[PDB]
Each structure stands twice: as structure tokens, then as C-alpha cells.
Amino acid sequence: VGIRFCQECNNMLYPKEDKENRILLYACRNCDYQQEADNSCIYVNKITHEVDELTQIIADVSQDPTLPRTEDHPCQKCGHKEAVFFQSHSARAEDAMRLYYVCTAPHCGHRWTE
Amino acid sequence: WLLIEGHTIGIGDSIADSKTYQDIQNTIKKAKQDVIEVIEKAHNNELE
Ligand SMILES: [Zn+2]
Ligand SMILES: [Zn+2]
């Protein structure tokens, strides 16, 4: 699923056949470097494309004056009472109005959903 | 005949009484509370 580059000319490696040892290999198209493939999968696409948006939330958003903040839900690590909340906040986000919570405590930034 | 009768429009036509005003305010408060409840249901993933 990942992209690996050549160690000689720093170009993209391409997967290709090793017809005698019968093993997938990655080889550079601009030189003769070859590297054994460990993942043994090349192409994958998730059509439903379900992704956790908690990875796409920056912890800096706790400093935003415009976001709402609640007192009922405390943080899990530091137990801070105050925490901001917001929706999915992105296009092509299917249909969900689910809230995402970010702790607004100094040197914190734990993110949880409910 | 309209010279004898007369026709007009004024403040007293556009005003209402306090009982109706309080009924209207109660209806608006109930509607806002219902919208808040629906918003809570949507945010808690309880909306079918
Ligand atoms: Zn190369
Ligand atoms: Zn916290």
C-alpha cells in the first residue's frame, strides 16, 4: 500500500516479476537496483473509504475561540473538565453529525468520540 | 356610503392582548426546546 523509493537515484520503485525464484520484487526503472518485497500486496482501494477522523484532528484546535466547549464530558487521561467539541468538519464525510471531543487542557490533546 | 362609514388601519389593529402574547411566547419556547432535543438526539447518534 506504501510507496518506497530507490536507494541509489531516489526514484520510485516499481513492482515486477521474478520469474525463476517466483517472488515479488521492487526494482527501479532508471537503474538496476532491486529490493525484496515484504508486504506482498501492491494495490488496494477501500470503496466505502471509512476512515477515523480522529487521526485528522489537530490537537491545536483547543485554542480556537469559536469552537463550543462543554463541561459534562471530562478528558480520559488528565481528567480535565473542560473540552471543546465539533462535528466532522469536512466534505464527502457521508451522513453523520457525530461529535468529536478535544480536551482543552495545557500539554494535553487527547481526542475521543462518543 | 364609505364617506359615512369610514375605513382605516392603525396600531390597535396590529396589537394583541397579553394572554395571546404569553401563549405565543410559550409556543416559541416549546419549539426551541424541541429543536434542542432533536439536536441532542442527532449529536448522540440516536437519530434514525
Ligand atoms: Zn534507482
Ligand atoms: Zn485532557
Strand pairing category for A100-103 and A111-113: antiparallel
Experimental approach? cryo-EM
> Domain spanning A46-114: which CATH class is it, in words?
mainly beta
CB A7 within 8 A of CB A33: yes
The identity of residue A57, as a single letter, is: I
C-alpha cell at position A65? 475561540
| Residue spans per domain, chain A | 1-45, 46-114
Of the candidates A20, A26, A114, A28, which has an alpha carbon nearest to the alpha carbon of residue A72?
A: A114
| Least Cα separation, residue A77 to chain B (angstroms) | 22
Mutation to test the A interface, candidates B36, B39, B44, B48, most A Cβ within 10 Å: B44
C-alpha cell at position B27? 409556543
Q: A with B: how many residue pairs have Cβ under 8 Å apart?
A: 8
Count of beta carbons in the 10 Å neighbourhood of residue A6: 19
- With contacts defined as CB-CB under 8 Å, which chain B residues touch A99? 43
A96 touches chain B (CB under 8 A): yes
Residue A9 marked as a ligand binder: yes
C-alpha cell at position A49? 473509504
Residue A41 marked as a ligand binder: no
C-alpha cell at position B36? 434542542
Resolution (A): 3.0
Residue/partner pairs of B8-17 with CB below 8 Å, 24 or more apart? none
A99 touches chain B (CB under 8 A): yes
- List CB contacts of B10: < 8 A, sequence separation 6 or more: none
CA A90 to chain centre: 15
Q: How far apart (Å, rounded) are the C-alpha atoms in residues A12 and A15?
A: 10
